[PDB]
Design a protein around this ligand. Structure first.
Ligand SMILES: CC(C)(COP(=O)(O)OP(=O)(O)OC[C@H]1O[C@@H](n2cnc3c(N)ncnc32)[C@H](O)[C@@H]1OP(=O)(O)O)[C@@H](O)C(=O)NCCC(=O)NCCS
Ligand SMILES: CC(C)(COP(=O)(O)OP(=O)(O)OC[C@H]1O[C@@H](n2cnc3c(N)ncnc32)[C@H](O)[C@H]1OP(=O)(O)O)[C@@H](O)C(=O)NCCC(=O)NCCS
Lengths: 134, 153
């Protein structure tokens, strides 16, 4: 049971996000989309996505569908829920015209890295990001 | 009016006349791209409102440059949007450690702010220790390290 998020789901979505305002912008925006997995009417997993038009490390085409975040409640892990949410994200990206899908994860997130490889992604590059307020 | 500025080292916003020298330098930052691709990049940068490059001129000769963009996409480690991102920066070996990059970045920062950016960001490879010391010495804070993934769709 996978669905594109709407206002009803906003509440369940926040609880999971808290574990991994915006729901507002996402609902309103065209380049934004979030998906949710339900067990007995309860959101037990989600994935946030966006269509990126700026440079994306490791990608040579534009726009790109970017998996901004993904989370599945510990107890529902290893049942294919993420594989399903990512396939929904891919479908959405592909018909918004993206020829490639991208994602990122921390060097310490070993399970995440294995999940990305198991789902067909290829590591492109590792980078350190910086920031300075103007 | 007591101290003329940029009498010998001057930071300029790139225009069509700098295309060839910028490209000459960019091939040294990013080897592997035909003069074509650099050129196409240069025309895109010139015509797009969220894109700009800066050229460091020593007595009229380009010795460094910085490519920047006003990013509206989410930018790792930032709380606001848009962000002025340093897409790349390069200074000829013979002119390093003289404050050039400092000025290119200050000019990028300044263009970013006038375009509504509250934050400036950059990224760099974990093998580039010199670039990591450069970012820290210039006031940037490391926000996060990540691994990027790609899948054709
Ligand atoms: C990453 C995460 C979303 C995976 O969710 P999931 O529902 O458990 O994943 P799936 O069951 O759909 O697994 C997809 C594939 O990855 C593999 N995988 C999942 N968990 C794994 C683990 N712990 N170790 C090794 N491989 C694993 C599965 O074996 C599966 O393999 P297959 O396709 O070859 O059959 C989940 O661990 C989680 O929510 N973690 C916390 C948040 C986080 O790390 N997010 C990542 C980036 S924001
Ligand atoms: C990174 C680079 C642009 C810096 O250019 P630069 O003109 O030499 O830098 P600056 O002189 O303005 O240096 C500013 C700051 O970095 C420090 N710095 C510069 N080179 C350094 C080095 N090799 N080791 C340690 N610190 C260094 C300066 O000392 C410091 O300022 P401070 O003295 O006021 O504290 C240049 O080395 C270069 O082109 N590197 C190769 C390409 C590259 O790696 N680009 C970055 C990623 S796209």
């Amino acid at each position: 049971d996978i669905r594109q998020m709407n206002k009803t789901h906003l509440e369940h979505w926040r609880g999971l996000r808290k574990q991994l305002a915006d729901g507002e912008e996402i609902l309103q925006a065209d380049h934004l989309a979030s998906f949710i997995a339900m067990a007995d009417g309860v959101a037990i997993g989600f994935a946030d996505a966006s269509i990126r038009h700026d440079y994306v490390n490791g990608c040579d085409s534009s726009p790109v569908v970017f998996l901004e975040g993904i989370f599945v409640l510990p107890s529902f892990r290893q049942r294919g829920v993420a594989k399903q949410l990512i396939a929904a994200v891919q479908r959405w990206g592909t018909n918004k015209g993206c020829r490639e899908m991208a994602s990122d994860t921390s060097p310490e997130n070993t399970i995440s890295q294995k999940v990305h490889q198991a789902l067909g992604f290829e590591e492109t590059e590792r980078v350190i990001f910086y920031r300075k307020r103007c």
